[PDB]
Design a protein around this motif. Sequence first.
Motif, PDB file in Angstrom:
ATOM      1  N   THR A   1       0.843  -1.184   0.000  1.00 55.21           N
ATOM      2  CA  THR A   1       0.000   0.000   0.000  1.00 55.21           C
ATOM      3  C   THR A   1       0.882   1.239   0.000  1.00 55.21           C
ATOM      4  O   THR A   1       2.001   1.206   0.524  1.00 55.21           O
ATOM      5  N   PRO A   2       0.409   2.340  -0.577  1.00 52.29           N
ATOM      6  CA  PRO A   2       1.171   3.591  -0.512  1.00 52.29           C
ATOM      7  C   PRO A   2       1.199   4.142   0.905  1.00 52.29           C
ATOM      8  O   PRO A   2       0.384   3.787   1.758  1.00 52.29           O
ATOM      9  N   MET A   3       2.173   5.018   1.148  1.00 51.49           N
ATOM     10  CA  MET A   3       2.330   5.608   2.470  1.00 51.49           C
ATOM     11  C   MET A   3       1.090   6.406   2.853  1.00 51.49           C
ATOM     12  O   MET A   3       0.610   7.243   2.083  1.00 51.49           O
ATOM     13  N   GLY A   4       0.573   6.144   4.051  1.00 47.56           N
ATOM     14  CA  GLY A   4      -0.598   6.834   4.543  1.00 47.56           C
ATOM     15  C   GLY A   4      -1.917   6.361   3.972  1.00 47.56           C
ATOM     16  O   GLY A   4      -2.951   6.973   4.266  1.00 47.56           O
ATOM     17  N   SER A   5      -1.918   5.307   3.165  1.00 49.23           N
ATOM     18  CA  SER A   5      -3.165   4.800   2.608  1.00 49.23           C
ATOM     19  C   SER A   5      -4.044   4.256   3.727  1.00 49.23           C
ATOM     20  O   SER A   5      -3.549   3.542   4.606  1.00 49.23           O
ATOM     21  N   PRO A   6      -5.344   4.564   3.735  1.00 47.59           N
ATOM     22  CA  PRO A   6      -6.203   4.107   4.834  1.00 47.59           C
ATOM     23  C   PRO A   6      -6.622   2.652   4.729  1.00 47.59           C
ATOM     24  O   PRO A   6      -7.211   2.129   5.685  1.00 47.59           O
ATOM     25  N   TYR A   7      -6.343   1.984   3.612  1.00 49.22           N
ATOM     26  CA  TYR A   7      -6.745   0.593   3.451  1.00 49.22           C
ATOM     27  C   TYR A   7      -5.793  -0.388   4.120  1.00 49.22           C
ATOM     28  O   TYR A   7      -6.146  -1.563   4.257  1.00 49.22           O
ATOM     29  N   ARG A   8      -4.604   0.052   4.535  1.00 49.08           N
ATOM     30  CA  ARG A   8      -3.676  -0.859   5.198  1.00 49.08           C
ATOM     31  C   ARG A   8      -4.214  -1.316   6.549  1.00 49.08           C
ATOM     32  O   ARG A   8      -4.136  -2.503   6.886  1.00 49.08           O
ATOM     33  N   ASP A   9      -4.761  -0.385   7.335  1.00 46.78           N
ATOM     34  CA  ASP A   9      -5.206  -0.706   8.686  1.00 46.78           C
ATOM     35  C   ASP A   9      -6.393  -1.664   8.672  1.00 46.78           C
ATOM     36  O   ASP A   9      -6.609  -2.388   9.647  1.00 46.78           O
ATOM     37  N   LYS A  10      -7.150  -1.705   7.578  1.00 50.27           N
ATOM     38  CA  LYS A  10      -8.247  -2.654   7.442  1.00 50.27           C
ATOM     39  C   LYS A  10      -7.829  -3.943   6.754  1.00 50.27           C
ATOM     40  O   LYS A  10      -8.352  -5.013   7.089  1.00 50.27           O
ATOM     41  N   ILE A  11      -6.889  -3.872   5.811  1.00 50.72           N
ATOM     42  CA  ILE A  11      -6.418  -5.084   5.158  1.00 50.72           C
ATOM     43  C   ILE A  11      -5.617  -5.941   6.131  1.00 50.72           C
ATOM     44  O   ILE A  11      -5.664  -7.175   6.060  1.00 50.72           O
ATOM     45  N   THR A  12      -4.894  -5.322   7.070  1.00 47.05           N
ATOM     46  CA  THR A  12      -4.216  -6.114   8.092  1.00 47.05           C
ATOM     47  C   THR A  12      -5.222  -6.783   9.020  1.00 47.05           C
ATOM     48  O   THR A  12      -5.014  -7.922   9.451  1.00 47.05           O
ATOM     49  N   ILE A  13      -6.328  -6.099   9.321  1.00 48.07           N
ATOM     50  CA  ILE A  13      -7.396  -6.706  10.110  1.00 48.07           C
ATOM     51  C   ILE A  13      -7.973  -7.910   9.379  1.00 48.07           C
ATOM     52  O   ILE A  13      -8.208  -8.968   9.976  1.00 48.07           O
ATOM     53  N   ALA A  14      -8.205  -7.766   8.073  1.00 49.58           N
ATOM     54  CA  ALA A  14      -8.725  -8.880   7.285  1.00 49.58           C
ATOM     55  C   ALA A  14      -7.751 -10.051   7.269  1.00 49.58           C
ATOM     56  O   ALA A  14      -8.160 -11.211   7.404  1.00 49.58           O
ATOM     57  N   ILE A  15      -6.457  -9.767   7.100  1.00 53.79           N
ATOM     58  CA  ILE A  15      -5.459 -10.833   7.070  1.00 53.79           C
ATOM     59  C   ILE A  15      -5.401 -11.548   8.413  1.00 53.79           C
ATOM     60  O   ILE A  15      -5.318 -12.781   8.474  1.00 53.79           O
ATOM     61  N   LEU A  16      -5.445 -10.789   9.509  1.00 54.55           N
ATOM     62  CA  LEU A  16      -5.430 -11.408  10.830  1.00 54.55           C
ATOM     63  C   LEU A  16      -6.680 -12.244  11.071  1.00 54.55           C
ATOM     64  O   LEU A  16      -6.600 -13.315  11.682  1.00 54.55           O
ATOM     65  N   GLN A  17      -7.844 -11.779  10.611  1.00 51.45           N
ATOM     66  CA  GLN A  17      -9.055 -12.581  10.763  1.00 51.45           C
ATOM     67  C   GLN A  17      -8.954 -13.876   9.971  1.00 51.45           C
ATOM     68  O   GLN A  17      -9.332 -14.948  10.462  1.00 51.45           O
ATOM     69  N   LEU A  18      -8.444 -13.793   8.742  1.00 52.56           N
ATOM     70  CA  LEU A  18      -8.274 -14.987   7.926  1.00 52.56           C
ATOM     71  C   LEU A  18      -7.318 -15.969   8.590  1.00 52.56           C
ATOM     72  O   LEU A  18      -7.562 -17.180   8.597  1.00 52.56           O
ATOM     73  N   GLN A  19      -6.220 -15.461   9.156  1.00 54.06           N
ATOM     74  CA  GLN A  19      -5.269 -16.328   9.846  1.00 54.06           C
ATOM     75  C   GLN A  19      -5.888 -16.958  11.087  1.00 54.06           C
ATOM     76  O   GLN A  19      -5.675 -18.145  11.359  1.00 54.06           O
ATOM     77  N   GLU A  20      -6.651 -16.177  11.856  1.00 51.95           N
ATOM     78  CA  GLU A  20      -7.254 -16.692  13.080  1.00 51.95           C
ATOM     79  C   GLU A  20      -8.281 -17.776  12.782  1.00 51.95           C
ATOM     80  O   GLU A  20      -8.322 -18.804  13.466  1.00 51.95           O
ATOM     81  N   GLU A  21      -9.119 -17.566  11.764  1.00 54.19           N
ATOM     82  CA  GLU A  21     -10.083 -18.594  11.393  1.00 54.19           C
ATOM     83  C   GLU A  21      -9.430 -19.802  10.740  1.00 54.19           C
ATOM     84  O   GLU A  21     -10.108 -20.814  10.535  1.00 54.19           O
ATOM     85  N   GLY A  22      -8.142 -19.726  10.413  1.00 55.17           N
ATOM     86  CA  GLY A  22      -7.453 -20.820   9.768  1.00 55.17           C
ATOM     87  C   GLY A  22      -7.656 -20.911   8.275  1.00 55.17           C
ATOM     88  O   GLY A  22      -7.164 -21.865   7.659  1.00 55.17           O
ATOM     89  N   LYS A  23      -8.364 -19.955   7.671  1.00 54.11           N
ATOM     90  CA  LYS A  23      -8.626 -20.033   6.239  1.00 54.11           C
ATOM     91  C   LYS A  23      -7.378 -19.731   5.420  1.00 54.11           C
ATOM     92  O   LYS A  23      -7.279 -20.166   4.268  1.00 54.11           O
ATOM     93  N   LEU A  24      -6.419 -18.994   5.988  1.00 56.30           N
ATOM     94  CA  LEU A  24      -5.136 -18.823   5.311  1.00 56.30           C
ATOM     95  C   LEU A  24      -4.339 -20.119   5.285  1.00 56.30           C
ATOM     96  O   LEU A  24      -3.566 -20.351   4.350  1.00 56.30           O
ATOM     97  N   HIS A  25      -4.497 -20.966   6.302  1.00 55.05           N
ATOM     98  CA  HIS A  25      -3.804 -22.247   6.302  1.00 55.05           C
ATOM     99  C   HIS A  25      -4.395 -23.210   5.282  1.00 55.05           C
ATOM    100  O   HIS A  25      -3.653 -23.986   4.669  1.00 55.05           O
TER     101      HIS A  25
END
Lengths: 51, 51, 50, 50, 51
Positions: free
Chosen positions: B11-35
């Motif tokens: 993401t570009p510097m200061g882009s507001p989508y990073r703080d939500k895309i990291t949340i999405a990635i963490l949710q995917l990892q927690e549910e195990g769907k990334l595995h």
Amino acid sequence: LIDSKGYGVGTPMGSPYRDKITIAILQLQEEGKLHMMKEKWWRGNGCPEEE
Amino acid sequence: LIDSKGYGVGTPMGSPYRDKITIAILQLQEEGKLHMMKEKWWRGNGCPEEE
Amino acid sequence: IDHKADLAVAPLAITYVREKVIDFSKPFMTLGISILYRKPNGTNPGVFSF
Amino acid sequence: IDHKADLAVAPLAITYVREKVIDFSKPFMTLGISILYRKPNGTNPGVFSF
Amino acid sequence: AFLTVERMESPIDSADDLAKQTKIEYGAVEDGATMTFFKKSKISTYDKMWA
Ligand SMILES: *[C@@H]1O[C@H](CO)[C@@H](O)[C@H](O)[C@H]1NC(C)=O
Ligand SMILES: *[C@@H]1O[C@H](CO)[C@@H](O)[C@H](O)[C@H]1NC(C)=O
């Protein structure tokens, strides 16, 4: 490994310290001294007790 | 493992989508769907062991 | 949450519950759940093992 | 850096040189250098065989 | 027992074990992540690999 949950450092949301600490941690990773720190605090104490 | 490099989306510097895309990635990892998608194609055919 | 300490550096797993409320940096070291098991005991000791 | 791409979802290694230019999310996989050597098969030397 | 079971095992099992030996030549990709990491590694078990 079964799960994958890395650690981190706390930082309030409205604080710019997160990006600077990110840069510093990446600098440590590139320099590789995080590896030797982990070896000192995990293997170094356990080095005399090697199998 | 020798190093501990990490991947991630760009993401570009200061882009507001990073703080939500990291949340999405963490949710995917927690549910195990990334595995599941990590095992989706890495186990392409399995290891043939007969002995 | 209340700015009493602005940098809580500690063993603190990155989680969805925490990440919404608190803001984390990159993982300075990654880990995961691993299975600990005692090494298989064997009848190696004993000079009279023959 | 030029805002020409809103996202860069791809295998981008999180590195210091890149981080000063762009913003990365938290990693979805943690990888690293590893040794690739061929699977051992039935073989043995001359004297060490016996 | 050796002939009946035939437990094959690679001569190298870790980074330091491959470092100590000299029969098996190492490998990397020129101007790649692995080679750049090995350069400037300043780690005891990888300085000899770079050498
Ligand atoms: C092997 O068996 C013994 C006796 O059952 C028990 O203490 C343990 O499971 C093993 N001991 C060791 C020293 O590994
Ligand atoms: C067995 O391993 C040797 C390693 O030197 C290799 O040269 C040979 O091709 C292998 N044979 C197989 C995989 O059938």
